[PDB]
Design a protein around this ligand. Structure first.
Ligand code: FAD
Ligand code: FAD
Ligand code: KJH
Ligand code: KJH
Ligand code: K
Ligand code: K
Lengths: 587, 587
């Protein structure tokens, strides 16, 4: 309790201890509101041990009454001392007094960093957010908001949507719409322009949002040179230094290139794909990550000639039964796979036409595991062979922020690095799921612990995911193989079923391709250890179930729940075929 | 325990008490399997009080060992007596010996009745399912499977889908597809033909399914004349009588007509809509149920001129804030509403063209609450002014099955009517949510209690729903107004937010129309009392959350869960604006 309280007092920029039923508190609140002074507030009457807290406060203030106002680790006064400060118009300089230029500097203006920034400023923390987008080899760059906004989830899903509309056009005819499909084509550059216009509205909405929370935004490359000092290089190359109490590292990752001749010069990554000025044309995706398969899938649904070169397996780290079903759907729907194949070199045959927005032309040479040569021409070659942080570009090694062997930041469960005022969130936080909503929740929850005395940690267990392949794949919890490894085969029951979306019946799409399973623990009341679903809208299906699983759902909790009919998701409420039973999951 | 056991013994058609680790049991199992004798099995080693049960069994068998086999309330033997019966080829006549023609007669071959039938036969119950479809006034009729399959959820959602594809065609252009929309039209009869072909495959799949579980299917009108006697009229008018141990009434409801001149002669209901041989054309829907709005919505999205005549409010019994938002979306997207208006008469101006499949033409006369006359021409007039059971057509009043004032069957929480061998499931069970998955779960769970010694009851609390209006509306739990009425305003907190599907950004659809809220109980740890969402795929969104709510989810359980990005459903995991705060839910 006093451990909690001295952390809180030391860390908050401007915090008020208070009670709901306290008119002097309210008059402090109103004076600060009226003064445009943002602050955290702890209502001691709403905590089970507010009494203990009010008492231990005397260790900081020499008093035990509410209101108590602190600034940057130091008691400032009760009601009368605040009004004294206000009426003398000394309050501004009081609440702005700091050893440092800022209470918080965020390095990286992405998902985690913007969320942490905004939330901190809400409680009075003087905040600066730094963001700079180092260009890709071909010079692609973009605005504020990080990987998801600009070159990730947002444009990725929009282009997935454009792909799904392909199949909407096909389905439309069976549902009675008179459509001349022989005279329908897709225009890559019209789609990119719409995608990029929505992104620009996000770049701009984030700038505006920072402005509206009095966050300082610096489009500058940050480098942490000591615990509290960040050296910024601006657009001009002008160098300067700013100081901050807390530092949040939220710099994300960038795509890796394979170390082969031609890769950097002639290939592209997802960084370039989503603003590509020309239709990629006949495309080779090298990789097997969810990024690789997502991109191949939508390019193929847009009518493209698409090949995916796979070294070993699809979606390493995901349930491999589900990965195979993902892959099988894509193969039967236009995506070619060069299985057990690696690339040796990219040779240029045509340069990109900057004039007519046409792709160039490339010769990809590689080899299969069976010794046969791979040699084929593609207009575009995309690498999706993983991503890596670039922290030597951000961290003077002298500061003492410890990195792991992969270059990610080693953190405690409250995101603290080995430099105690420096935290790391998002993709660079070693061992955490690399997902936008995780980074947002981490940054916001961290900001609350730093600046408003919260204690809640981010829960990184059982974080649900969706892969937006042509047929989508959502999961929450363990893969079937990881559950068996953890608990043993004898203790695992798997219930499963195929299903067919009603939307697919009249459209003449496949029976017994969509599929779901619950991976359960026999010895723990058939606890649901992992949920897996392959089918349309798989993220909408999966999300709600993640709440139940977080609460410890069992098979019996699924069974008790009544279905919504007609939906895909309702099939989770009637599963009865187990894998051990050997009975077929088909319907 | 002995109460449970004598119910079980009396009711099961063919049940075996047993243990997993019992070779004589297995040899009984295998002889019966080999004999094609279906039966229930209770493994006493898997119940906490299997010991007490094995003991109390001596009250029925004079023995205390496993295996113990019963038929229709009477001990039949241990291992040796069964093999004795088998080897003498007396076992068939033993397990077929019954006071009654059937162990179970289901009256009504719909959602509940087919599910109860199939599940009962699984455990050896000799089962007959009766179904007959009394024609609509214009002579429409259909095949096996009940209201949902033929004239409800299935064709309703398929035509909703055909409507959604309309908006897919519009969206397609913004996502880059070159589409001449000025030359696209919808063909009603092509859609109906696809819809009806899928229905026929369900009619046929249900027949096949009954055949494969040795259920007898009689396309005959059933009438219960005494507790155990059903009088059947067949296609021919040939009358006969069959007897059954247990009777399940699962006869559903039929559409009501308003008592006004012309309604029966010239209007139609949903019963007729889904196989209508002609495009309805300019249509008037009289009503404000979810059926009324669902039908108006898809007709309008198919290009139709659609008017809905509303007496008072939309969707009485649903959250009225959500109903208004549903209605507002439809008004801004092509549906006209004649508010506070009732019909007085339907006059015919043109007869339906049976030849060219063109609608007729009707004059609808009515009056508004303000005294102004309503008079307008429509090609089709649909009544969706509620539904009612027709039990006098099924129940000789002499049998003693008690009905309520609305003609529905008064039941205990195990679906038992006031005639103890007669149960009621589905829409005719008074006070229960009238939904297909409820009826399926009730029928299956009931069948298990009757014929395999199960005890689990159906849980009718917090049953989630989705209304498939043009913008869909899913709910689970209480409306905001019912929660306030139950607990009082002071004890209710409502968190809410607008949201925008990512799919809508590039498509230029509305900000701040989709919407969700959690209705919570302050004094019970912010327990989620009701969840409400308006937006695409609202049934996929809502379903998973119904499991969490069944488990007692609180706001904190929602907050702890990490979102899947990008999805609509993820917004439930980050809600923070309360209604009391007066802060706007817009984003
Ligand atoms: C193709 C692709 C698709 C994806 N799809 C999804 C999805 O569908 N759902 C999901 O949840 N996640 C998805 N992700 C992951 C998601 O993008 C990341 O989890 C998220 O963007 C990372 O948040 P972050 O804050 O860690 O880093 P980022 O979002 O990458 O932000 C880091 C920012 O800091 C900048 N920066 C780097 N160094 C400096 C420096 N010295 N000074 C100043 N600024 C610097 C970076 O240029 C960047 O702008 C996808 C990723 C990719 C590559
Ligand atoms: C337009 C409409 C849309 C709907 N959409 C949905 C939805 O989207 N999701 C959902 O969950 N629910 C929906 N419903 C409700 C759903 O249809 C019902 O809950 C379900 O069909 C009722 O199941 P049941 O077994 O009670 O009766 P029914 O399905 O109606 O089956 C009763 C059967 O018994 C027959 N019968 C009647 N009398 C006799 C007799 N004497 N002898 C023999 N047979 C007889 C009947 O003709 C019928 O075939 C919808 C209903 C309507 C009208
Ligand atoms: C296992 C696979 C599959 O099923 C389909 C495609 C594929 C491609 C590359 C590697 C493996 C697979
Ligand atoms: C409250 C309504 C609304 O918002 C829109 C349409 C409507 C139609 C009939 C009755 C009420 C409404
Ligand atoms: K269920
Ligand atoms: K959350």
């Amino acid at each position: 309790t006093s451990q909690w309280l001295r952390k809180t007092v030391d860390s908050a920029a401007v915090i008020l201890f208070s009670k709901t039923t306290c008119p002097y508190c309210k008059k402090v609140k109103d004076v600060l509101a009226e003064a445009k002074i943002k602050h955290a507030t702890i209502e001691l009457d709403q905590l089970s041990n507010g009494s203990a807290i009010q008492k231990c406060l005397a260790s900081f203030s020499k008093i035990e009454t509410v209101p108590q106002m602190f600034v940057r680790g130091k008691f400032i006064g009760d009601s009368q001392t605040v009004l004294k400060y206000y009426s003398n118009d000394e309050l501004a300089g009081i609440v702005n007094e700091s050893k440092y230029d800022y209470d918080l500097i965020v390095i990286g203006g992405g998902s985690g960093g913007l969320a942490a920034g905004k939330e901190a400023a809400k409680y009075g923390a003087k905040t600066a957010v730094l963001d700079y987008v180092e260009p890709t080899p071909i010079g692609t760059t973009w605005g504020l908001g990080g990987t998801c906004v600009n070159v990730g989830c947002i444009p990725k899903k929009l282009m997935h949507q454009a792909g799904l509309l392909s199949h909407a056009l096909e389905d439309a005819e069976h549902f009675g719409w008179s459509l001349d499909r022989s005279k329908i084509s897709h225009n890559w550059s019209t789609m990119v322009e719409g995608v990029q216009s929505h992104i620009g509205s996000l770049n701009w909405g984030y700038k505006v949002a920072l402005r509206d929370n009095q966050v300082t935004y610096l489009n500058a490359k940050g480098r942490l040179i000591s615990p509290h000092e960040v050296q910024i290089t601006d657009k001009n190359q002008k160098v300067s230094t700013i100081t901050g109490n807390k530092i949040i590292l939220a710099t994300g990752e960038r795509p890796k290139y394979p170390e082969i001749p031609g890769a950097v010069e002639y290939g592209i990554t997802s960084d370039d794909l989503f603003s590509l000025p020309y239709f990629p044309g006949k495309t080779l995706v090298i990789g097997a990550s969810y990024v690789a398969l997502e991109c191949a899938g939508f390019l193929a649904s847009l009518g493209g000639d698409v090949t995916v070169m796979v070294r070993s397996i699809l979606l390493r780290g995901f349930d491999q039964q589900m990965a195979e079903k993902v892959g099988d759907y894509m193969e039967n729907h236009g995506v070619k796979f060069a299985k057990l194949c690696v690339p040796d070199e990219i040779k240029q045959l045509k340069v990109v036409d900057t004039e007519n927005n046409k792709p160039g032309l490339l010769l990809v040479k590689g080899h299969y595991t069976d010794g046969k040569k791979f040699e084929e021409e593609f207009e575009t070659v995309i690498f999706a062979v993983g991503r890596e942080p670039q922290l030597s570009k951000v961290l003077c090694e002298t500061v003492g922020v410890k990195l792991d062997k992969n270059g990610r930041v080693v953190c405690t469960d409250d995101e603290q690095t080995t430099v105690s005022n420096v935290y790391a969130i998002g993709d660079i936080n070693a061992g955490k799921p690399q997902l936008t909503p995780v980074a947002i929740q981490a940054g916001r929850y961290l900001a609350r612990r730093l600046f408003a005395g919260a204690t809640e940690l981010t829960d990184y267990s059982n974080v649900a995911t969706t892969v937006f392949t042509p047929l989508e794949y959502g999961a929450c919890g363990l893969s079937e193989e990881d559950a068996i490894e953890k608990y043993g085969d004898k203790d695992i029951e798997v219930y499963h079923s195929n299903f067919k979306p009603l939307e697919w019946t009249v459209a003449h799409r496949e029976d017994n391709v969509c599929y779901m399973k619950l991976v359960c623990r026999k010895s723990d009341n058939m606890r649901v250890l992992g949920l897996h679903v392959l089918g349309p809208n798989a993220g909408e299906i999966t999300q709600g179930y993640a709440v139940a699983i977080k609460m410890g759902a069992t098979k019996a909790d699924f069974d008790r729940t009544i279905g919504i009919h007609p939906t895909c998701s309702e099939t989770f409420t009637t599963l009865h075929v187990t894998k051990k039973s050997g009975v077929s999951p088909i319907v």
